[PDB]
Amino acid sequence: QNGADIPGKDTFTKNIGACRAYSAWLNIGGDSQVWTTAQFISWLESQGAFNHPYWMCKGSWAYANNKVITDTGCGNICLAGAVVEVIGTRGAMTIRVTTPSTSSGGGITNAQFTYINHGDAYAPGWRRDYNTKNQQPAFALGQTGSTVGNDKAVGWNWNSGVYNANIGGASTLILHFNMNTGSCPAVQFRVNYRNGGIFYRSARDGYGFEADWSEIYTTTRKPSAGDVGAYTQAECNSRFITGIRLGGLSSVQTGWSDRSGYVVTGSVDTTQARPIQYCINGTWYNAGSI
């Protein structure tokens, strides 16, 4: 007989205090219309879910038979092929809904939702797990994505992360931050191996990165004197005079005719003259005369 001769078997289960396995392939609703959680708890009422302390159920593997909930605040719930577990009372309600790897209507796949309703003053609502399929949106350890084809290939609106970029024969590190908002939504740093150089570029509105990398100056990548508007030492040394003097003496017995660069330095009879000389970078030169 094996209990097949039991009237009101659902009441029996309640009396014995056993968990209610309500259905393995039930169609939750008529069709895949959209339904609210108030309508979901109404449908649970009509099947007697709150008559049992634990009451489970599994939506049929048919998209055209099962509702979808749309007011969770943490993603849609497609009841097609969804496990529904109901714990508590109609007063103090706990539903745990486990979704499968495929859905319709925008349902979150590979998820466990949990619904509490302990009264309207006690914050009713839904929550969703994080898992290896539905990760938390967090900056990843390790490498984000796959290697991109050139150093500028990470788009301004990609996930923040550490990326590898091909530069031909080697590759370079791209450290990308993006917040999807603001006048500057993103910044990227390019880093070459073995302190080979570090650079940044930053975005603008929805226009991406309009400027080329700016290389950051460091003690292994110092500015040049021209970068800062100055001369190098060698450029100063080759232009400006450091000394003036009179050169070797010449004389004549009398007279001394004007000679390019020469000045009279003595009139003993005899006239003495020397060239004016000036020094640039250690080298002396004779002055000339117009």
Site for a second copy in 154-193 (CB under 8 A): 159-160, 162-164, 170-173, 175, 177-187, 189, 191-193
Contacts of 143 (CB under 8 A, 6+ apart): 161, 162, 163, 164
Roughly how many angstroms between the first and final C-alpha of the chain, as a whole number?
A: 135
- Of 49, 128, 151, 154, the residue at the interface with a second copy (CB under 8 A) is 128
In 3D space, the residue among 134, 76, 83, 81 whose CA is nearest the CA of residue 105 turns out to be 76
Instruction: Tell me how far, at minimum, the Cβ of 88 lies from a second copy, in Å.
Output: 5
Among the listed ranges 8-16, 28-36, 37-45, the one in contact with a second copy (CB under 8 A) is 8-16
Contact status, residue 99 vs residue 131, Cβ threshold 8 Å: no
Closest to a second copy by CB, 70 vs 171, is: 171
- Of 122, 253, 282, 283, the residue at the interface with a second copy (CB under 8 A) is 122
Instruction: Tell me how far, at minimum, the Cβ of 38 lies from a second copy, in Å.
Output: 17
Contacts of 10 (CB under 8 A, 6+ apart): 20, 48, 51
**How many CA atoms lie less than 13 Å away from 188 in the CB half-sphere?**
28
Q: Phi first, then psi: what are they for 274, rounded to 5°?
A: -140, 155
Instruction: Tell me how far, at minimum, the Cβ of 281 lies from a second copy, in Å.
Output: 11
- Of 140, 149, 150, 153, the residue at the interface with a second copy (CB under 8 A) is 140
**CA 124 to the chain's CA centroid:** 34
- Of 31, 34, 153, 245, the residue at the interface with a second copy (CB under 8 A) is 245
Instruction: Tell me how far, at minimum, the Cβ of 261 lies from a second copy, in Å.
Output: 7
Contact status, residue 174 vs residue 186, Cβ threshold 8 Å: no
Q: Per CB under 8 A, which of residues 259..278 are in contact with a second copy?
A: 259-269, 271-274, 276, 278
130 binds a second copy (CB under 8 A): yes
Q: How many CB atoms lie within 10 A of CB 289?
A: 10
In 3D space, the residue among 123, 111, 114 whose CA is nearest the CA of residue 88 turns out to be 114
Total residues in contact with a second copy, by rule CB under 8 A: 168
Q: What is the DSSP string of 149-185?
A: SSTT-S-TTSPSEEEEEE-SSSEEEEEEEE-S-SSS-
d(CA 83, CA 61): 11
- Of 27, 39, 43, 54, the residue at the interface with a second copy (CB under 8 A) is 54
Instruction: Tell me how far, at minimum, the Cβ of 62 lies from a second copy, in Å.
Output: 10
- Of 34, 64, 153, 241, the residue at the interface with a second copy (CB under 8 A) is 241
Instruction: Tell me how far, at minimum, the Cβ of 215 lies from a second copy, in Å.
Output: 5
- Of 27, 129, 152, 155, the residue at the interface with a second copy (CB under 8 A) is 129
Q: Per CB under 8 A, which of residues 89..108 are in contact with a second copy?
A: 89, 91-92, 94, 96, 98, 100-102
46 binds a second copy (CB under 8 A): no
- Of 106, 138, 149, 153, the residue at the interface with a second copy (CB under 8 A) is 138
In 3D space, the residue among 107, 109, 89, 80 whose CA is nearest the CA of residue 44 turns out to be 89
Closest to a second copy by CB, 70 vs 164, is: 164
148 binds a second copy (CB under 8 A): no
